[PDB]
């Protein structure tokens, strides 16, 4: 893996793990706040996260 | 009901809090910024693979394969 | 040990021996225990090495780590560094063994039949080696006579070094040395002025020399804590507890084990190059490590490189625990990590 | 023994000989049956060995480990390590059997002649030997005449290798030795200093010196400890209980079975190379071994790799249960030991 | 905790939390100099574990080692790079810094008392109580820290004229060069006077060593008399009270001269973020400090990195804490 700027070409296969390193790591920090952090009162009436239909919804939006 | 062992150790994940939120916006501000920041990455990736963005010696073709 | 507050601690398996910090008699057996299985280490695995020995290839290339020291010191290398005979490590691993045996056996009797708290024996020759966490007056003492056996060893090195001789990579045999002191030396490699950089050492009549001078330095310090109480400022700097003092003797052992680290990566005159191999270079990654200037395929690893690598790590984490126990004499309970994020 | 706090243990019977801890009489017995057993061992091994003996292969390949003993002390052995006639090891073999069928006939005579106890015992002289575990001026004469009888039978060797002469590698046949007495060379080898290391020992007549001085030294520790009871700074560090001096006992015969145990594998003299084979070399991996420096390919392995790593374990376990009696007569129970992964200390005195 | 906007006590703001607290907000600083500290001597040590001797430095990419060539360290005629340990010496001396300030930083965060007002009544620390209302506590503190800028300098330049000198671009190799001491000719720089006339970028048209390091001399005496200014006085002066200020506080310009926490705060955001696009500009055009052996020719990005830094500390910080400061000057 190398962080210099030529990682982003998309045919350099150097970008790849590149990726799968940083966004990894990029990914548990996303997981510990989420496994602590609550959500706002805001939010969670807005997307309604009470309710996995918007789970389905935002996750068949994703794939 | 069944009070099995693996309930007994995931129980306080599935429901501890469950129905609980901060009240107010709490974090969201600074996920506001977060989406900006990815919206960005995302935005520069796409030029740098549409070839609007050209790096230097970055050439985004086939020829970058060279060296393996 | 720490206790926030709370007494009657309960203290699991995975962590016991905080149980006994409060009983002298077990403290001295514990440590006689340590200080057992360290020669015992160092007896056995002389054997070891010696039976896995092939007077034919390098000896650095071969994993050794006992036999290029105890060579380095004379006792079976002649000339060209080559070991000659292997006899004197294995007398000298049997005495390591049997030293070991009487440490543990002291180190048993003070489990069983010593006395838990060294007060309340009856003996009262055994009253006077108690202490207490508190005191400075009587630990300034104790560290007055280990000071004192410290400078002892660094002087007996030095005699031997002077009379019987020991290894010279520069002369390529066993000499008798003598001591090339002077102050104004010392002190130019003490301040790594251009051509003294206490690292590079070229002539092993200056190692001697300032053998010698931390030998008096030693046995002047011993004498002068046996003697001298510690100052009334040192109670406001300090702490009083155990933890405290293993904290400082922690940070102590990082620095030592930082600077041998250190010397044996880089120095060749201290470490000859037939004994230990060719010289390291420092590399830093996500995390540092030295690696060796020649070839390490088909002879895996010198003994320069087990020793350095292992002794870094070694400083690292007793550096970091160091911290730790500073932390823990300073108050601060840990169990505020899995606490604040339950509130957030 | 130790019964901790609660007299009156009851013992399984696979610990079933501490029961007689407190009874002399069955105490003498059981001893005298063992010393039985081990002179019956010799002769009888001796003999076993001389059915299958071979003079075309040489000694040490075939397994044996009396052959070599006896004809290293005279007994029957040519020059150059020849076994020319071999009635006297039938002989040795028969003189220990019979004092064999004597202690076994005097171990029964014991293990039913009288009380249990010997305080009891009408026989107002056999009172004269019983003894207690707290005692130590009875325990010190009977050290004392133990040591007068290895002191004696240090002589006794002494004696022999004067008169009837003994083998010498160095001089390759059965030879007279003179009885050397130097004390500055006896302690040169205390020291180990370079010229004299204790086991390297190279002349028979430093080793007859070594021996007319053990004998001395026996026989007037044993006039000592016969005359003298023991200081009290002995009964200070010491325990007095039976359990106690079977651990000091057992440190020291572990000590004395691993000395033994090097001594076999690297000295030639003592141990000549004809008779056991050549020197082994002491190799340390997980466990101490000895390799027997020969190819084992179509030679087994000599006498003498049997007897030192045999000895070495023997050592090695004597020396662990020391430990573990020492441990018990100073007062540890090892069932805290099952309170290791509770809350609960592991640990009295 | 001294402020009510809406989210005082939220932990992702935490840090507002030590507005008050002297003892703890001094071991932050000094944990984060710590970590500005391990990052140069980490990154050197790694760059010259992977330095290459044929090819020159600004083909091996290398952020550290430039910067350290162009003193003179580790380099001779020519400006080849010859021994690397003097670059390994200071990575070493970085980490020790580091270490210090992180003993003190645990020391202050945990041992040491968390607010300086509990101090025990003149024990050495009372001394350094300072409070963010009064200015005569927070001028010994300026007056100090600009003694320790103005001795750096002056060490930097002393070092420069006297001993083992600096890489001097047009000699061409490492030289103790002659300092030029014309106060006008250095000061007209600012204005953009260059000898060879008016420049776009002040300061950064410097054609000589000698200019540089006349104006580090000029640049440490002006800051030790600014600092015996500020440790000898302590007293408020018209300049900074009855001066016009333009805020919502009161509608239109007023010559209050406030003061408060979130001001001070803005004020130095505002003057880091100038000191970026400064240097932005530096490095844009000034090669004389720069010189192309070492960085390359080409050095567009780093200036914009500079300039995009600027811009954020100087825009965003500045404006965010000084609005912020005027609110609630409202009390
Ligand atoms: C790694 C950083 C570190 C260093 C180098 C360090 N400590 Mg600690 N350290 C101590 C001493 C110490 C000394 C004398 C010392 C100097 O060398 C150090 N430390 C040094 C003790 C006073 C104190 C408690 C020490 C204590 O009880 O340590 C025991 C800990 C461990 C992991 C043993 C597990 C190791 C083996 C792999 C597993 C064995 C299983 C066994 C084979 C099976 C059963 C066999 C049986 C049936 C026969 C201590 C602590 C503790 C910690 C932690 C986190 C540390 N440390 C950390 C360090 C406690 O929780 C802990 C603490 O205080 O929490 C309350
Ligand atoms: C040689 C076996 C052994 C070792 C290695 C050993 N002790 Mg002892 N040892 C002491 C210190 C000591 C230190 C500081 C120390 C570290 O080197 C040791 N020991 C080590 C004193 C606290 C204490 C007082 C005797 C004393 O130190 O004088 C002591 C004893 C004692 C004994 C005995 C038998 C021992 N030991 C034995 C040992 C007391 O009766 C005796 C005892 O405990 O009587 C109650
Ligand atoms: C293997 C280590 C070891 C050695 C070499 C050893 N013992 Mg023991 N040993 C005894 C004698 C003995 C003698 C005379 C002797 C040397 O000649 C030894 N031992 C030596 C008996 C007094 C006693 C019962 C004999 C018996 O169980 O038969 C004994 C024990 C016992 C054990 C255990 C574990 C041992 N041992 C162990 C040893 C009882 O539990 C067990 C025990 O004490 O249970 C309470
Ligand atoms: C010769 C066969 C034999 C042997 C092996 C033997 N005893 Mg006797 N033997 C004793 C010790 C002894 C020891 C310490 C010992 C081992 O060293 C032996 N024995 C061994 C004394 C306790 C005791 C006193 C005689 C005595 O002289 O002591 C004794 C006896 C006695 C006899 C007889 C006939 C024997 N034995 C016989 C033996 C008593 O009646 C006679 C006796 O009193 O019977 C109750
Ligand atoms: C997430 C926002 C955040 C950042 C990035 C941040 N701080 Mg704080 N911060 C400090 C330094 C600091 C430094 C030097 C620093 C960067 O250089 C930061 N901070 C940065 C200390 C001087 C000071 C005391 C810190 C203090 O007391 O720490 C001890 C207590 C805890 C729990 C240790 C923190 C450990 C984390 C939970 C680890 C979890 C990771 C996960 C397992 C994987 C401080 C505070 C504090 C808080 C809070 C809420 C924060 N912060 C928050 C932050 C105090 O209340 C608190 C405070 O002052 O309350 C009055
Ligand atoms: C507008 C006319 C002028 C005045 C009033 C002026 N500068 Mg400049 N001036 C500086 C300080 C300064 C101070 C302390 C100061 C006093 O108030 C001034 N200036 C004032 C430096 C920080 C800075 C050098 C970089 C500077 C420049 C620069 C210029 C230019 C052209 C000027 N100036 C010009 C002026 C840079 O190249 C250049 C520039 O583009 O930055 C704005
Ligand atoms: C000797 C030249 C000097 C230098 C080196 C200097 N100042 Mg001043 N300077 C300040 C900060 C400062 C900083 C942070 C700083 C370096 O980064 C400097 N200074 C530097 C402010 C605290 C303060 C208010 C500036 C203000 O806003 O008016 C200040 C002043 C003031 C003066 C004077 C005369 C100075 N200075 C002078 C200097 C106020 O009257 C005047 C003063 O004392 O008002 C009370
Ligand atoms: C204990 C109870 C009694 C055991 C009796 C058999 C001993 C076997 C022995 O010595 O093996 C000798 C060999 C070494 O081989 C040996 O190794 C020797 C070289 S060295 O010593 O290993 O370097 C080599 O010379 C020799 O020929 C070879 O056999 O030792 C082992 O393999 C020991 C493995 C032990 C593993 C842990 C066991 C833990 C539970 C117990
Ligand atoms: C200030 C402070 C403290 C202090 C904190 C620290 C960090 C204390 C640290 C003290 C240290 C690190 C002392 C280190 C001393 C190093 C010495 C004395 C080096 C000695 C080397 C000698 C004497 C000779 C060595 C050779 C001898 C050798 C044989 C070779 O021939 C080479 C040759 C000639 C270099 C406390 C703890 C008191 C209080 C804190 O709160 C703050
Ligand atoms: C110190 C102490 C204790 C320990 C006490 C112990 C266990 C002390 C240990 C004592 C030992 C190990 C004594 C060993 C003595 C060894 C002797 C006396 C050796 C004699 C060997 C001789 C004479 C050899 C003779 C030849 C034999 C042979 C032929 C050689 O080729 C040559 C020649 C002729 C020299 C405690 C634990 C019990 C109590 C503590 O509080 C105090
Ligand atoms: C107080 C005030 C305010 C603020 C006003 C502002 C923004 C004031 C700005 C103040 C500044 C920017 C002061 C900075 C002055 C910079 C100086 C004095 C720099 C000197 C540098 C020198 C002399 C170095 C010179 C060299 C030295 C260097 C080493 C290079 O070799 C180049 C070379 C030779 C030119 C408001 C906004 C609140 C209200 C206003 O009305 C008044």
Same mark, same amino acid.
């Given at each position: 893996?190398?962080?210099?700027?030529?990682?982003?070409?998309?045919?350099?296969?150097?970008?790849?793990?590149?990726?799968?390193?940083?966004?990894?790591?990029?990914?548990? =920090?996303?997981?510990?706040?989420?496994?602590?952090?609550?959500?706002?009162?805001?939010?969670?009436?807005?997307?309604?996260?009470?309710?996995?239909?918007?789970?389905?919804?935002?996750?068949?939006?994703?794939? | 009901?069944?009070?099995?062992?693996?309930?007994?150790?995931?129980?306080?994940?599935?429901?501890?809090?469950?129905?609980?939120?901060?009240?107010?916006?709490?974090?969201?501000?600074?996920?506001?910024?977060?989406?900006?920041?990815?919206?960005?990455?995302?935005?520069?990736?796409?030029?740098?693979?549409?070839?609007?963005?050209?790096?230097?010696?970055?050439?985004?073709?086939?020829?970058?394969?060279?060296?393996? | 040990?720490?206790?926030?507050?709370?007494?009657?601690?309960?203290?699991?398996?995975?962590?016991?021996?905080?149980?006994?910090?409060?009983?002298?008699?077990?403290?001295?057996?514990?440590?006689?225990?340590?200080?057992?299985?360290?020669?015992?280490?160092?007896?056995?695995?002389?054997?070891?090495?010696?039976?896995?020995?092939?007077?034919?290839?390098?000896?650095?290339?071969?994993?050794?780590?006992?036999?290029?020291?105890?060579?380095?010191?004379?006792?079976?290398?002649?000339?060209?560094?080559?070991?000659?005979?292997?006899?004197?490590?294995?007398?000298?691993?049997?005495?390591?063994?049997?030293?070991?045996? =009487?440490?543990?056996?002291?180190?048993?009797?003070?489990?069983?039949?010593?006395?838990?708290?060294?007060?309340?024996?009856?003996?009262?020759?055994?009253?006077?080696?108690?202490?207490?966490?508190?005191?400075?007056?009587?630990?300034?003492?104790?560290?007055?006579?280990?000071?004192?056996?410290?400078?002892?060893?660094?002087?007996?090195?030095?005699?031997?070094?002077?009379?019987?001789?020991?290894?010279?990579?520069?002369?390529?045999?066993?000499?008798?040395?003598?001591?090339?002191?002077?102050?104004?030396?010392?002190?130019?490699?003490?301040?790594?002025?251009?051509?003294?950089?206490?690292?590079?050492?070229?002539?092993?009549?200056?190692?001697?020399?300032?053998?010698?001078?931390?030998?008096?330095?030693?046995?002047?310090?011993?004498?002068?804590?046996?003697?001298?109480?510690?100052?009334?400022?040192?109670?406001?700097?300090?702490?009083?507890?155990?933890?405290?003092?293993?904290?400082?003797?922690?940070?102590?052992?990082?620095?030592?084990? #930082?600077?041998?680290?250190?010397?044996?990566?880089?120095?060749?005159?201290?470490?000859?190059?037939?004994?230990?191999?060719?010289?390291?270079?420092?590399?830093?990654?996500?995390? $540092?490590?030295?690696?060796?200037?020649?070839?390490?395929?088909?002879?895996?690893?010198?003994?320069?490189?087990?020793?350095?690598?292992?002794?870094?790590?070694?400083?690292?984490?007793?550096?970091?625990?160091?911290?730790?126990?500073?932390?823990?004499?300073?108050?601060?309970?840990?169990?505020?990590?899995?606490?604040?994020?339950?509130?957030? | 023994?130790?019964?901790?706090?609660?007299?009156?243990?009851?013992?399984?019977?696979?610990?079933?000989?501490?029961?007689?801890?407190?009874?002399?009489?069955?105490?003498?017995?059981?001893?005298?049956?063992?010393?039985?057993?081990?002179?019956?061992?010799?002769?009888?091994?001796?003999?076993?060995?001389?059915?299958?003996?071979?003079?075309?292969?040489?000694?040490?390949?075939?397994? !044996?480990?009396?052959? %070599?003993?006896?004809?290293?002390?005279?007994?029957?052995?040519?020059?150059?390590?020849?076994?020319?006639?071999?009635? $006297?090891?039938?002989?040795?073999?028969?003189?220990?059997?019979?004092?064999?069928?004597?202690?076994?006939?005097?171990? =029964?005579?014991?293990?039913?002649?009288? $009380?249990?106890?010997?305080?009891?015992?009408?026989?107002?002289?056999?009172?004269?030997?019983?003894?207690?575990?707290?005692?130590?001026?009875?325990?010190?004469?009977?050290?004392?005449?133990?040591?007068? !009888?290895?002191?004696?039978?240090?002589?006794?060797?002494?004696?022999?290798?004067?008169?009837?002469?003994?083998?010498?590698?160095?001089?390759?046949?059965?030879?007279?030795?003179?009885?050397?007495?130097?004390?500055?060379?006896?302690?040169?080898?205390?020291?180990?200093? %370079?010229?004299?290391?204790?086991?390297?020992?190279?002349?028979?007549?430093?080793?007859?010196?070594?021996?007319?001085?053990?004998?001395?030294?026996?026989?007037?520790?044993?006039?000592?400890?016969?005359?003298?009871? %023991?200081? $009290?700074?002995?009964?200070?560090?010491?325990?007095?209980?039976?359990?106690?001096?079977?651990?000091?006992?057992?440190?020291?015969?572990?000590?004395?079975?691993?000395?033994?145990?090097?001594?076999?594998?690297?000295?030639?003299?003592?141990?000549?190379?004809?008779?056991?084979?050549?020197?082994?070399?002491?190799?340390?991996?997980?466990?101490?071994?000895?390799?027997?420096?020969?190819?084992?390919?179509?030679?087994?392995?000599?006498?003498?790799?049997?007897?030192?790593?045999?000895?070495?374990?023997?050592?090695?376990?004597?020396?662990?249960?020391?430990?573990?009696?020492?441990?018990?007569?100073?007062?540890?129970?090892?069932?805290?030991?099952?309170?290791?992964?509770?809350?609960?200390?592991?640990?009295?005195? | 905790?001294?402020?009510?906007?809406?989210?005082?006590?939220?932990?992702?703001?935490?840090?507002?939390?030590?507005?008050?607290?002297?003892?703890?907000?001094?071991?932050?600083?000094?944990?984060?100099?710590?970590?500005?500290?391990?990052?140069?001597?980490?990154?050197?040590?790694?760059?010259?574990?992977?330095?290459?001797?044929?090819?020159?430095?600004?083909?091996?990419?290398?952020?550290?080692?430039?910067?350290?060539?162009?003193?003179?360290?580790?380099?001779?005629?020519?400006?080849?790079?010859?021994?690397?340990?003097?670059?390994?010496?200071?990575?070493?001396?970085?980490? !020790?810094?580091?270490?210090?300030?992180?003993?003190?930083?645990? #020391?202050?965060?945990?041992?040491?008392?968390?607010?300086?007002?509990?101090?025990?009544?003149?024990?050495?620390?009372?001394?350094?109580?300072?409070?963010?209302?009064?200015?005569?506590?927070?001028?010994?503190?300026?007056?100090?820290?600009?003694?320790?800028?103005?001795?750096?300098?002056?060490? #930097?330049?002393?070092?420069?004229?006297?001993?083992?000198?600096?890489?001097?671009?047009?000699?061409?190799?490492?030289?103790?060069?002659?300092?030029?001491?014309?106060?006008?000719?250095? =000061?007209?720089?600012?204005?953009? !006077?260059?000898?060879?006339?008016?420049?776009?970028?002040?300061?950064?048209?410097?054609?000589?060593?000698?200019?540089?390091?006349?104006?580090?001399?000029?640049?440490?005496?002006?800051?030790?008399?600014?600092?015996?200014?500020?440790?000898?006085?302590?007293?408020?002066?018209?300049?900074?009270?009855?001066?016009?200020?333009?805020?919502?506080?009161?509608?239109?310009?007023?010559?209050?001269?406030?003061?408060?926490?979130?001001?001070?705060?803005?004020?130095?955001?505002?003057?880091?973020?100038?000191?970026?696009?400064?240097?932005?500009?530096?490095?844009?055009?000034?090669?004389?400090?720069?010189?192309?052996?070492?960085?390359?020719?080409?050095?567009?990005?780093?200036?914009?990195?500079?300039?995009?830094?600027?811009?954020?500390?100087?825009?965003?910080?500045?404006?965010?804490?000084?609005?912020?400061?005027?609110?609630?000057?409202?009390?």
């Amino acid at each position: 893996p190398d962080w210099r700027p030529f990682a982003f070409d998309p045919y350099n296969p150097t970008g790849l793990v590149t990726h799968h390193i940083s966004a990894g790591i990029a990914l548990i =920090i996303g997981g510990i706040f989420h496994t602590v952090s609550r959500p706002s009162e805001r939010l969670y009436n807005a997307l309604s996260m009470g309710n996995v239909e918007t789970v389905l919804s935002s996750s068949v939006a994703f794939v | 009901p069944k009070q099995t062992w693996w309930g007994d150790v995931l129980k306080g994940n599935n429901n501890s809090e469950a129905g609980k939120f901060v009240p107010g916006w709490g974090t969201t501000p600074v996920m506001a910024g977060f989406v900006v920041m990815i919206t960005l990455l995302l935005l520069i990736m796409l030029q740098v693979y549409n070839h609007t963005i050209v790096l230097d010696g970055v050439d985004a073709g086939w020829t970058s394969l060279g060296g393996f | 040990m720490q206790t926030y507050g709370q007494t009657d601690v309960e203290y699991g398996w995975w962590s016991g021996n905080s149980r006994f910090s409060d009983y002298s008699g077990q403290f001295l057996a514990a440590h006689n225990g340590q200080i057992a299985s360290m020669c015992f280490w160092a007896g056995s695995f002389t054997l070891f090495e010696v039976s896995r020995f092939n007077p034919d290839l390098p000896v650095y290339q071969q994993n050794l780590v006992c036999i290029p020291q105890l060579a380095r010191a004379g006792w079976g290398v002649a000339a060209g560094g080559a070991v000659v005979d292997t006899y004197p490590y294995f007398a000298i691993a049997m005495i390591h063994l049997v030293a070991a045996a =009487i440490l543990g056996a002291g180190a048993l009797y003070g489990v069983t039949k010593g006395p838990k708290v060294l007060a309340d024996s009856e003996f009262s020759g055994a009253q006077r080696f108690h202490f207490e966490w508190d005191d400075f007056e009587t630990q300034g003492r104790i560290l007055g006579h280990h000071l004192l056996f410290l400078g002892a060893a660094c002087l007996l090195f030095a005699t031997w070094a002077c009379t019987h001789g020991v290894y010279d990579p520069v002369a390529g045999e066993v000499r008798a040395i003598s001591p090339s002191l002077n102050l104004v030396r010392f002190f130019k490699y003490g301040w790594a002025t251009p051509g003294f950089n206490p690292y590079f050492v070229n002539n092993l009549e200056d190692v001697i020399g300032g053998h010698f001078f931390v030998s008096s330095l030693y046995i002047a310090g011993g004498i002068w804590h046996i003697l001298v109480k510690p100052w009334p400022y040192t109670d406001k700097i300090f702490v009083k507890s155990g933890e405290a003092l293993l904290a400082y003797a922690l940070a102590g052992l990082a620095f030592a084990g #930082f600077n041998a680290a250190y010397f044996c990566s880089v120095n060749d005159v201290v470490f000859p190059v037939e004994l230990f191999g060719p010289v390291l270079e420092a590399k830093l990654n996500v995390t $540092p490590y030295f690696a060796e200037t020649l070839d390490a395929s088909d002879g895996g690893h010198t003994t320069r490189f087990w020793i350095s690598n292992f002794h870094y790590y070694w400083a690292f984490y007793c550096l970091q625990g160091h911290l730790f126990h500073a932390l823990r004499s300073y108050g601060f309970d840990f169990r505020r990590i899995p606490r604040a994020l339950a509130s957030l | 023994m130790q019964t901790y706090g609660n007299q009156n243990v009851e013992y399984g019977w696979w610990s079933g000989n501490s029961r007689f801890t407190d009874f002399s009489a069955q105490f003498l017995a059981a001893h005298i049956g063992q010393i039985a057993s081990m002179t019956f061992f010799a002769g009888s091994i001796t003999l076993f060995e001389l059915s299958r003996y071979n003079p075309d292969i040489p000694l040490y390949a075939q397994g !044996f480990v009396c052959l %070599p003993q006896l004809s290293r002390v005279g007994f029957g052995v040519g020059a150059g390590g020849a076994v020319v006639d071999t009635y $006297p090891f039938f002989a040795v073999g028969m003189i220990h059997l019979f004092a064999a069928a004597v202690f076994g006939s005097g171990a =029964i005579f014991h293990i039913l002649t009288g $009380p249990k106890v010997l305080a009891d015992s009408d026989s107002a002289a056999s009172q004269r030997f019983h003894f207690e575990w707290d005692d130590f001026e009875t325990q010190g004469r009977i050290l004392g005449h133990h040591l007068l !009888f290895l002191g004696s039978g240090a002589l006794l060797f002494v004696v022999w290798a004067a008169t009837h002469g003994i083998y010498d590698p160095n001089v390759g046949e059965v030879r007279a030795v003179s009885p050397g007495f130097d004390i500055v060379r006896i302690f040169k080898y205390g020291w180990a200093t %370079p010229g004299f290391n204790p086991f390297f020992v190279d002349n028979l007549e430093d080793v007859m010196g070594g021996h007319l001085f053990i004998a001395l030294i026996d026989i007037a520790g044993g006039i000592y400890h016969i005359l003298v009871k %023991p200081w $009290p700074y002995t009964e200070r560090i010491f325990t007095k209980s039976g359990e106690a001096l079977l651990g000091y006992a057992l440190g020291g015969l572990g000590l004395m079975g691993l000395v033994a145990a090097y001594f076999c594998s690297v000295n030639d003299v003592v141990f000549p190379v004809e008779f056991f084979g050549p020197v082994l070399q002491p190799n340390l991996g997980f466990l101490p071994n000895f390799a027997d420096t020969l190819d084992v390919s179509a030679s087994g392995h000599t006498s003498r790799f049997w007897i030192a790593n045999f000895h070495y374990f023997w050592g090695f376990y004597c020396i662990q249960g020391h430990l573990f009696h020492a441990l018990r007569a100073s007062g540890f129970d090892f069932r805290v030991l099952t309170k290791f992964f509770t809350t609960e200390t592991v640990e009295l005195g | 905790t001294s402020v009510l906007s809406n989210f005082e006590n939220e932990w992702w703001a935490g840090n507002v939390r030590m507005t008050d607290l002297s003892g703890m907000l001094l071991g932050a600083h000094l944990c984060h100099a710590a970590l500005m500290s391990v990052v140069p001597g980490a990154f050197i040590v790694q760059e010259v574990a992977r330095y290459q001797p044929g090819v020159s430095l600004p083909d091996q990419g290398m952020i550290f080692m430039p910067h350290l060539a162009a003193l003179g360290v580790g380099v001779g005629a020519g400006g080849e790079i010859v021994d690397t340990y003097p670059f390994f010496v200071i990575g070493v001396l970085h980490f !020790f810094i580091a270490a210090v300030c992180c003993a003190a930083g645990l #020391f202050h965060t945990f041992r040491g008392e968390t607010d300086l007002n509990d101090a025990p009544d003149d024990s050495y620390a009372a001394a350094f109580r300072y409070e963010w209302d009064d200015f005569e506590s927070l001028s010994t503190i300026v007056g100090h820290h600009l003694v320790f800028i103005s001795v750096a300098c002056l060490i #930097f330049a002393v070092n420069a004229t006297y001993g083992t000198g600096m890489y001097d671009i047009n000699t061409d190799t490492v030289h103790q060069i002659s300092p030029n001491l014309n106060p006008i000719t250095l =000061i007209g720089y600012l204005f953009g !006077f260059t000898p060879d006339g008016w420049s776009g970028a002040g300061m950064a048209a410097v054609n000589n060593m000698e200019d540089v390091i006349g104006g580090h001399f000029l640049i440490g005496v002006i800051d030790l008399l600014g600092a015996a200014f500020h440790i000898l006085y302590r007293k408020p002066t018209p300049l900074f009270t009855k001066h016009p200020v333009f805020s919502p506080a009161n509608g239109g310009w007023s010559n209050v001269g406030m003061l408060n926490s979130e001001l001070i705060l803005s004020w130095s955001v505002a003057s880091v973020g100038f000191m970026g696009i400064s240097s932005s500009l530096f490095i844009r055009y000034c090669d004389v400090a720069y010189p192309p052996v070492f960085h390359g020719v080409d050095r567009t990005g780093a200036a914009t990195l500079q300039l995009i830094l600027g811009l954020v500390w100087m825009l965003g910080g500045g404006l965010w804490h000084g609005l912020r400061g005027e609110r609630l000057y409202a009390a």
